[PDB]
Amino acid sequence: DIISVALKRHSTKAFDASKKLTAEEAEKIKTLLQYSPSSTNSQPWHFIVASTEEGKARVAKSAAGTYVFNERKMLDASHVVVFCAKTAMDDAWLERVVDQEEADGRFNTPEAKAANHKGRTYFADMHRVDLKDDDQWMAKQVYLNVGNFLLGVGAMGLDAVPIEGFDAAILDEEFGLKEKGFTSLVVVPVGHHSVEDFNATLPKSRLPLSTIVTEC
Amino acid sequence: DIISVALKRHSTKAFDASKKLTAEEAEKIKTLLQYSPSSTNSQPWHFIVASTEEGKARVAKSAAGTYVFNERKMLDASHVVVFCAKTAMDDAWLERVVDQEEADGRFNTPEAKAANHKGRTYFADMHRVDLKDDDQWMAKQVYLNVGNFLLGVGAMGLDAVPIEGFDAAILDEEFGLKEKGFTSLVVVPVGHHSVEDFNATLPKSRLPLSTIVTEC
Ligand SMILES: Cc1cc2nc3c(=O)[nH]c(=O)nc-3n(C[C@H](O)[C@H](O)[C@H](O)COP(=O)(O)O)c2cc1C
Numbered sequence: 001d002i003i004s005v006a007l008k009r010h011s012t013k014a015f016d017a018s019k020k021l022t023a024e025e026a027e028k029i030k031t032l033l034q035y036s037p038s039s040t041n042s043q044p045w046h047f048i049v050a051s052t053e054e055g056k057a058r059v060a061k062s063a064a065g066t067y068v069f070n071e072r073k074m075l076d077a078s079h080v081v082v083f084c085a086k087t088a089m090d091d092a093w094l095e096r097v098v099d100q101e102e103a104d105g106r107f108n109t110p111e112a113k114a115a116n117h118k119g120r121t122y123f124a125d126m127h128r129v130d131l132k133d134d135d136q137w138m139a140k141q142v143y144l145n146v147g148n149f150l151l152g153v154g155a156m157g158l159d160a161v162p163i164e165g166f167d168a169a170i171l172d173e174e175f176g177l178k179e180k181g182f183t184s185l186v187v188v189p190v191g192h193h194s195v196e197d198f199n200a201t202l203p204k205s206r207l208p209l210s211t212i213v214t215e216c
Numbered sequence: 217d218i219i220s221v222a223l224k225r226h227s228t229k230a231f232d233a234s235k236k237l238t239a240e241e242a243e244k245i246k247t248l249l250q251y252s253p254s255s256t257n258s259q260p261w262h263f264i265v266a267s268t269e270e271g272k273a274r275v276a277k278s279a280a281g282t283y284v285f286n287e288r289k290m291l292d293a294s295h296v297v298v299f300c301a302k303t304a305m306d307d308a309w310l311e312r313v314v315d316q317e318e319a320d321g322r323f324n325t326p327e328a329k330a331a332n333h334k335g336r337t338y339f340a341d342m343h344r345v346d347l348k349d350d351d352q353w354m355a356k357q358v359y360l361n362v363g364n365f366l367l368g369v370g371a372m373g374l375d376a377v378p379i380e381g382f383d384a385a386i387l388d389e390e391f392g393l394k395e396k397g398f399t400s401l402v403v404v405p406v407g408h409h410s411v412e413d414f415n416a417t418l419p420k421s422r423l424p425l426s427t428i429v430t431e432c
């Protein structure tokens with residue numbers, strides 16, 4: 001029951017450094033990252049999936065100073081996913097998206113593909129040209145991916161914890177994302193919580209529906 | 217299997233206007249909106265859940281002109297959720313969150329509550345003062361909620377379609393959101409797709425893992 005999952009999944013505060021994801025689970029979390037929806041199927045993202053001790057150590061460089069209290073989560077987890085967004089929407093990327101859709105058989109005619117491309121470009125330009133906010137627009141799609149991911153891993157019976165408490169400048173530099181056209185937004189360690197993960201047993205807390213929801 | 221859900225859910229292009237969510241399902245989608253995680257559990261959001269004909273018609277007003285291709289989705293779906301983000305992070309809201317967590321028994325000691333309050337304040341301020349980007353920060357949390365929601369309704373066997381193709385200015389004005397301290401970001405009609413939903417049978421398309429994922 002997905003509703004039970006939502007009422008049960010939690011932000012892991014401690015991971016068992018001995019429990020690793022199975023090969024199948026590792027394949028599945030990558031599938032979750034890949035198949036998340038996005039505006040115009042723009043998929044303005046890239047993901048770093050660190051599973052080796054060296055890889056996790058590189059990501060952990062971002063848990064410096066003020067963020068040092070997040071270091072252990074990044075080091076003890078089985079797999080650590082760094083969610084990155086494109087820094088600018090280039091035509092090259094838009095072309096890749098529409099060409100992939102054609103390859104997957106989503107268009108019944110060439111005109112249909114051209115129309116899809118025109119439309120995606122039209123909305124991309126709305127952000128790139130008019131609003132000048134394509135960077136924030138794409139970052140938003142990445143957070144949506146994070147939302148999809150957290151519930152998905154929870155539904156897999158796996159533990160995870162979303163992290164904004166990291167130095168993105170440091171992380172970007174460590175992986176040369178700037179030069180690749182990406183920037184890190186959220187770090188998500190995934191694995192199995194340890195017995196010491198006190199947050200696994202604390203009740204979930206949210207504001208009441210009477211405050212957050214308006215029915216019409 | 218949640219992975220089968222991710223590989224099967226799709227953006228509904230046509231809903232069967234006669235199929236409504238059951239009372240239980242209507243309560244469950246609200247639970248999904250409410251329990252989505254967010255940075256510091258800030259829950260910087262508000263949701264309009266329109267299920268009456270006039271309610272949906274009012275939301276549909278935002279799908280005028282260029283966006284008319286999204287009008288029928290909003291009108292025919294059973295429940296249409298308008299995802300809104302707060303326009304500014306006020307101290308009262310921050311206090312509400314910690315006080316709610318205290319009320320929910322998440323703090324065994326006063327020191328525990330203090331640590332939580334300290335942490336939230338530090339990062340809320342980082343965005344409200346240091347970066348002056350709390351509007352974008354909260355919007356990001358709302359998109360995360362959307363990602364959680366789409367996968368959730370999918371796992372419930374319900375159809376939906378996320379929508380950015382609407383005039384937020386019109387929608388905000390229609391529901392007097394600005395005066396209430398909110399702004400609309402994404403509209404999500406939820407229901408059951410009709411056999412005329414061309415996207416229900418089209419293959420899902422995403423760029424290859426070799427392009428979007430880096431393993432370390
Ligand atoms: C934030 C967001 C906004 C979107 N807006 C629209 C919209 O206005 N109309 C529409 O038909 N689809 C819309 N889409 C659906 C995308 O085209 C879709 O998610 C993508 O092509 C991948 O297909 P899927 O959702 O079937 O997996 C939106 C998706 C997201 C995630």
Ligand SMILES: Cc1cc2nc3c(=O)[nH]c(=O)nc-3n(C[C@H](O)[C@H](O)[C@H](O)COP(=O)(O)O)c2cc1C
Nearest residue numbers: 009010011070162163164165186253254255256257
């Ligand atoms: C974008 C985002 C960033 C977050 N960052 C951190 C972090 O840096 N460290 C941490 O321990 N928890 C972090 N959290 C966890 C929140 O405190 C948590 O999601 C929230 O309190 C609700 O509790 P839940 O996830 O157990 O349901 C983050 C959550 C989100 C959604």
